[PDB]
Design a protein around this ligand. Structure first.
Ligand SMILES: CC1(C)CO[C@@H](c2ccccc2Cl)CN1
Ligand SMILES: CC1(C)CO[C@H](c2ccccc2Cl)CN1
Length: 164
């Protein structure tokens, strides 16, 4: 192992990402991309310039689990290869902001039952599973949450470390 993982997480910032469906998380895992609404896009762009690593921790609503976590490798950008997200009814892709490139650190699941001992000081000390899309997770809570995930032996953090 966990040493390179701990190195990547050092002095990182952490954000809870809530997806309405598994299909969008699968697309993010396959393509290394994420997009969010403009209020959260602005927060994440500020964070990306502010810290050595910005970590997104993903949870599909109603799943009772986190589906993994990833590190921002860029600020948001427009005009790239379009992403065939599952948009909610009535909503358009023009309501979205840019696309963030991300490097996955763990693609494994973690059930909320395993994180019940972790509370987030930035969300009223509620269990870390609770929070709106984009909620920041304080450093110690976010580090411990990431360390609870099963190790993802398919991932080599060597190339991630070199981007910092
Ligand atoms: C360094 C810091 C992020 C500062 O804020 C601390 C805190 C947050 C919310 C309520 C109480 C306290 Cl002590 C946690 N560590
Ligand atoms: C980018 C995505 C994974 C999919 O699209 C969602 C959306 C698009 C347009 C308006 C509202 C919403 Cl929620 C947000 N997350």
């Amino acid at each position: 192992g966990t040493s390179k993982l701990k190195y990547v997480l050092q002095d990182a910032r952490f954000f809870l990402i809530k997806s309405n469906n598994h299909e969008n998380v699968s697309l993010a895992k396959a393509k290394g991309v994420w997009s969010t609404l403009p209020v959260n896009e602005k927060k994440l762009n500020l964070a990306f310039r502010s810290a050595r690593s910005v970590i997104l921790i993903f949870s599909v609503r109603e799943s009772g689990k986190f589906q993994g976590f990833a590190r921002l490798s860029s600020e948001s950008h427009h005009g790239g290869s379009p992403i065939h997200w599952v948009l909610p009814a009535g909503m358009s892709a023009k309501m979205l902001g840019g696309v963030f490139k991300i490097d996955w650190i763990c693609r494994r699941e973690l059930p909320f039952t395993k994180s019940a001992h972790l509370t987030n000081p930035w969300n009223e000390h509620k269990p870390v599973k609770i929070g709106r899309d984009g909620q920041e997770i304080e450093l110690e809570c976010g580090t411990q949450l990431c360390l609870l995930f099963p190790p993802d032996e398919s991932i080599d953090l060597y190339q991630v470390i070199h981007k910092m």
